[PDB]
Amino acid sequence: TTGSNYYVRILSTIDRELLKPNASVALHKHSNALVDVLPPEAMLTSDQKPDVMYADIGGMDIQKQEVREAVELPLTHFELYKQIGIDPPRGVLMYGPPGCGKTMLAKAVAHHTTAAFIRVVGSEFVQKYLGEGPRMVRDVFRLAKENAPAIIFIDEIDAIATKRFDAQTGADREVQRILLELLNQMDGFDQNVNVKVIMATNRADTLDPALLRPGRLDRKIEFPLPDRRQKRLIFSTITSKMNLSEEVDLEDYVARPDKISGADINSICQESGMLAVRENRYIVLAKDFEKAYKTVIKKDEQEHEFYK
Amino acid sequence: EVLRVTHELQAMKDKIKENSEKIKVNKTLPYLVSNVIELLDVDKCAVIKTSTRQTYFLPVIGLVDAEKLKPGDLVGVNKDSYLILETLPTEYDSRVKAMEVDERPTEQYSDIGGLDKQIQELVEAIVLPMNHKEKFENLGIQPPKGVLMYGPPGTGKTLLARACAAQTKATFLKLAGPQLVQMFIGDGAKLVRDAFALAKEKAPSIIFIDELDAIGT
Amino acid sequence: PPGTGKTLLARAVAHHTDCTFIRVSGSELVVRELFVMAREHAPSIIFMDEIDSISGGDSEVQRTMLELLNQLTKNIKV
Amino acid sequence: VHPEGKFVVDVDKNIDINDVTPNCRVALRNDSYTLHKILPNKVDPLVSLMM
Amino acid sequence: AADKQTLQSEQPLQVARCTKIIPKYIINVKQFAKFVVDLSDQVAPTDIEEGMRVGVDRNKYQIHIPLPPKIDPTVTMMQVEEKPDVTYSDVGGCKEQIEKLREVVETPLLHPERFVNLGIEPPKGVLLFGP
Amino acid sequence: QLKELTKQYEKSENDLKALQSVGQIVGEVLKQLTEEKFIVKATNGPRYVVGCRRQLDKSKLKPGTRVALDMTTLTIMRYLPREVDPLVYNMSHEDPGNVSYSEIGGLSEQIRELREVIELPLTNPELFQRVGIIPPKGCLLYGPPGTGKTLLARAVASQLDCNFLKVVSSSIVDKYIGESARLIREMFNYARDHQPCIIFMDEIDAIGGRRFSEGTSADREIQRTLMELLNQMDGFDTLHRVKMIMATNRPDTLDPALLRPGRLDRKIHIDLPNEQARLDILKIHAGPITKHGEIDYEAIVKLSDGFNGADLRNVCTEAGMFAIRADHDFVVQEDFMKAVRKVADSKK
Amino acid sequence: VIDAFRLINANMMPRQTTSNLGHLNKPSIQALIHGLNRHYYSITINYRKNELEQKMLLLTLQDYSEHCKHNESVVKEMLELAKNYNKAVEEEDKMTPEQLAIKNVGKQDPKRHLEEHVDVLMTSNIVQCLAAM
């Protein structure tokens, strides 16, 4: 772990059994002779911590059955893919602009895993110690391997994987081997025990054109910035967890369909309630709905008459 | 009891102070620097981060108090025993300490010509709060902040700079524009904040930034 | 059209012949040094990229290796 | 060498310096810096940009 | 070819960046821990100041030699050296705008007695326009 | 001759017994309380197997605990609490200048609104799930410059109880790689420790996005720092006690990811003084300077609009300047009138 | 690891020993240790003990679930581990060289596992069962 690999001699008492090519194994101080293999010490299993349901996700149905289809179903029904013929897709790449269904769908996947949903945000793969990170992220991968079935969730990859690197001064001499051996690590698991690498990122316009190639991902899930037949369901959910006094209308503000996330639906509806806290009201009737919506109901754009 | 005056003193000068003052002679020759990062209390004791990029815990030892130990200062340490011997006042590079012009006055206010309301305006705006602030405070108004001089291609800007800094009787620093932008992320930023830290430590001082077009896009 | 014969015909007849299949599609992490590798392999096949939709992208390197390839240790086929 | 990439070293009698060709990593300069033997070729350059 | 006896009295020495003086002063090896050290035996206290660089040994980590500053990429620029063979009798066809150029470039020569004589400081810059 | 040396000399015998001490390296126990031996991670160091104190409290040695280790023998010593950086030069100190809402002029809607959104979830949190919604987290103080941004949080700094983490966003970033992300996870974990807390990151265009394609060293180092700051503003919780607010010029260069309601919900547009707020600023910075009686504020406010609070204290500063080189008693009406008409010369 | 020593602070100025005692020409010969051995000069450590102390220092479980559920267990790994032993003897019969690629450090370990399994039950499914009789 002190920098380099270097040659050794291993003793006879240890068996040549557990020495996998990423097996963390101990060495001797001042000698560096191998002594004993170790349990996979490394990241957290995330025991029951994140909590949004898959029932209050709102609207998202086709993406919910695609991620339900390609992540937790091949971990449970692992052999039906070995009764039809089509393989489980290895990774899941989620590109969402500007972000609607990223991290409550990857949060409500984490309830009914019955599987080691290990999280890691993809930004501490770089560390101040040089040559540290690749060893770190392969500790992450094997920490999902000996805990199978597991779901590796690594966010915002474009932190560690971009199209454009720099051969000189080594700010990115190591992040071109964060991505490189991780790119070699995911190819080392085609024997298919159970490890699924789902991953999300706000934008995939500059992700990398070698991060997919049917083996490292095999998938791509568009998140839609929803419209008419979905927007109604988002309002139905978010209003269904509030106090309403039916002076509100639903489809009036489903109408004017103009460029909303789900996050700003939570902002105009949350803002509707908080604007009802002014008169110390336990409900919301007419203006706080319309009121907050207009205030921040997209604080407008910039039309442009003549053309149009 | 009259034998107890200074004879038991000097055996502890020789033992206690040959040893203790021997490592206090090692305050100079092998001595090391560090930055303490916190100071906590166990039933004091600190965590220093020595500048070979590693950090050690230690019970805090003599010649440094719990009051003259601020988290983030520049405090030295031994190079084998790793106990903080004495403090050092806070530091930075010489790229900011290169701005220490002493050879200022040879361009007086007589060599500048034809701009005398700008001399009255600038010199009133700068060295009058250096010699008459209290009278100024008796009016009860805030001292004016930095003065931006500007002109077409080349008038009397820098000549009013070292002409005003000529007869100021303060300390002064000739900070350029493109000294502040370098290839690293940290250096450009670190050195302006430590430039104003120098000016605060050595205050009262005025600062000339020549050619803001460097940091002006 | 996008699909239908790319990256797969040039793959298949590269490996019926057991030639090699070097792809310089993309320049992410590392021109002229690749020629040495191809020369060492003795026989080789270099493949390219096709992006317009699913200014001087890879026609630059294209010719850049047809300039060295025109006068040229001979059984390399871009 | 791996951490810091250069040195010029020797080779033991039973190594026959004639076959040991470039980009075929193996070393042993244990302390004085002198070779012993050879190891797994360790996949040359293109093996890299293919895999 | 016989410098074996003198190599042991050389003390291979590490350059470090000097800073403040309290005596004591702080060096900075740019790979080590920028630490406190005094002068050896013979170097003057007015010979070593801030900013400059001095050499530090590796045994008891102490300074012996003050060292010149670094110019790493502009070493090749310098003042060329030797210099090409064309001269004033070669570049012909102008005859006066040499003499404007000549009197500015050639005042470390004879010329400074004229300029400290009749109180001139010479121009510093010269600009050379042409198609 | 004896009590003096006894007290102020024998008290200084402590240098030898403290001089005997040796110091202890620190590290983080990657847990695996392998019973008799644990595997810890040193700071710049390798992971390795360490023996234990033998009567240590092993049962609370949690994975991710700062622990002190011996140097020579290297057995683990007395544990440590979770560290803090010079975030002490962040939390423990900022710019709270007993400035109050009295000095804030003419934006009572914005400061009552910011005060209610920021500390009113900390006064009465029970009224929000009563209505049926969690309170919002962030506000983005976008506006033209001057205008009371940095200060506004000065007035918030000197009127609240929790540790107001007031930081400039460009003293964050350092030359070492992966360092700024260490600083921002240290900041938000420090916010997890002391609650409820307020984190003030002004001027944030240093960490402000509209992420690029090509500078590749000086920008992608921060466009992965904004990934850690962004994925801890978001997190997998909602941070549930701490509320950060950010104040900047140029909101039209910020990242869309950091603007999506959630990271910053109620974006506040602080605006230039209209006429009423103009006379408010004029009275407040015209307060402690000595005055006239029937000094015509209304023609000053009527005269030329489009100023800022900074420009109106520039007006009173220039008029006091006029008296201070002109040697009068306070000002006159023609000194404010000569003051505005030189500030009105100061356009772009 | 036990060793006493001397006062050879000074006096660099007899004991035939049968040729310098043996095992201090074999210490862990390390320079700071051997430089310490200039002053140290360890000699021996003898030992005594008595017979008393020496001497001093020197069932069932049947079908609870026990006998079944450790011969219901291990015979299943004899089934499919003997299937992998079939795959081992079929595979390594031909195209085998260099000590089976160094004993398959990877995918450890076929065959021996079977031997271990065989050993486990025959010390258990007889012996205390024997004492049942």
Ligand SMILES: Nc1ncnc2c1ncn2[C@@H]1O[C@H](COP(=O)(O)OP(=O)(O)O)[C@@H](O)[C@H]1O
């Ligand atoms: N389809 C949806 N249904 C219900 N709530 C949503 C939906 N999309 C987004 N939200 C809400 O808006 C916020 C923004 O989520 P999002 O930006 O998609 O997260 P991320 O950027 O991590 O994918 C979330 O806190 C979530 O509660």
Ligand SMILES: Nc1ncnc2c1ncn2[C@@H]1O[C@H](COP(=O)(O)OP(=O)(O)O)[C@@H](O)[C@H]1O
């Ligand atoms: N009013 C002036 N009085 C004296 N010298 C002047 C004046 N205006 C220009 N100069 C000359 O110009 C030079 C300084 O130019 P300066 O105005 O400093 O250019 P810049 O403003 O771009 O620095 C000096 O050599 C000085 O003699």
Ligand SMILES: Nc1ncnc2c1ncn2[C@@H]1O[C@H](COP(=O)(O)OP(=O)(O)O)[C@@H](O)[C@H]1O
């Ligand atoms: N005639 C074909 N035979 C087999 N596969 C084909 C054929 N045409 C297209 N494909 C499919 O296209 C994929 C290969 O991509 P490719 O055709 O190289 O992309 P492009 O169309 O951009 O060249 C394979 O997965 C393959 O199944």
Ligand SMILES: Nc1ncnc2c1ncn2[C@@H]1O[C@H](COP(=O)(O)OP(=O)(O)O)[C@@H](O)[C@H]1O
């Ligand atoms: N008066 C002259 N006498 C001799 N050669 C001349 C004269 N004027 C121009 N030249 C020729 O022009 C060339 C100098 O090129 P130069 O003026 O440096 O081009 P550029 O201005 O593009 O650098 C020389 O070969 C030189 O002989």
Ligand SMILES: Nc1ncnc2c1ncn2[C@@H]1O[C@H](COP(=O)(O)OP(=O)(O)O)[C@@H](O)[C@H]1O
């Ligand atoms: N409403 C106001 N009342 C008083 N001062 C103000 C007001 N608005 C802006 N200012 C001025 O702005 C300064 C604080 O800086 P600020 O306006 O926040 O700029 P920035 O937003 O760049 O920090 C104060 O010193 C104050 O004089």
